[PDB]
């Protein structure tokens, strides 16, 4: 609206100057009547300008309320986020232990079978080394060359 105001200003200015100047050089009713029209329309635009100034003051109060509600929203957000993160790590470690419990639920063996199998796995040192071992000792945690060459696999097919 500033453009229309300023155009009405400069138009009023130099055309009123022209009316004054033709009066002065005489000693033009049409451009007079148009000057009357420009003056009235300029005063109407000044009234609209004061009204829009009231509108802008209302807008300033309103955007201050906007920023205050934005700050309230964000102060909800950050605290809800930190609560979310703490509970997320908590339920994650709990679901780790629950996964391990559910794997243990799948396999359930009688105790004597566990003891018997532990005896077969560690009567001869198969899964855990002999206590006095130096490199070059023949025994190994794999089958070994002699057990392979003396088994049914090596002998009975050959």
């Amino acid at each position: 609206t500033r453009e229309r105001l300023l155009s009405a200003l400069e138009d009023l200015e130099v055309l009123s100057r022209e009316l004054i100047e033709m009066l002065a050089i005489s000693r033009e009713n049409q451009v007079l009547e148009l000057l009357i029209h420009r003056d009235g329309e300029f005063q109407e635009l000044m009234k609209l300008a004061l009204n829009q100034g009231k509108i802008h003051h209302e807008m300033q109060v309103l955007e201050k309320e906007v920023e205050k509600r934005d700050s309230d929203i964000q102060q909800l957000q950050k605290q809800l986020k930190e609560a979310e993160q703490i509970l997320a790590t908590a339920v994650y470690q709990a679901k780790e232990k629950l996964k391990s419990i559910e794997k243990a639920r799948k396999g359930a063996i009688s105790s004597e079978e566990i003891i018997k199998y532990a005896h077969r796995i560690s009567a001869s040192n198969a899964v855990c080394a002999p206590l006095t071992w130096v490199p070059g000792d023949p025994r190994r945690p794999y089958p070994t060359d002699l057990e392979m060459r003396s088994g049914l696999l090596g002998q009975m097919n050959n």
């Binding site: 102060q75 605290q79 930190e82 609560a83």
Partner: peptide, 19 residues
């Protein structure tokens, strides 16, 4: 769990005080 609950609670306790 308890801490998270009371955390949520006090933040909710903050929000009508903004309203």
């Amino acid at each position: 769990l308890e801490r998270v609950i009371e955390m949520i609670q006090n933040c909710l306790a903050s929000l009508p005080d903004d309203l």
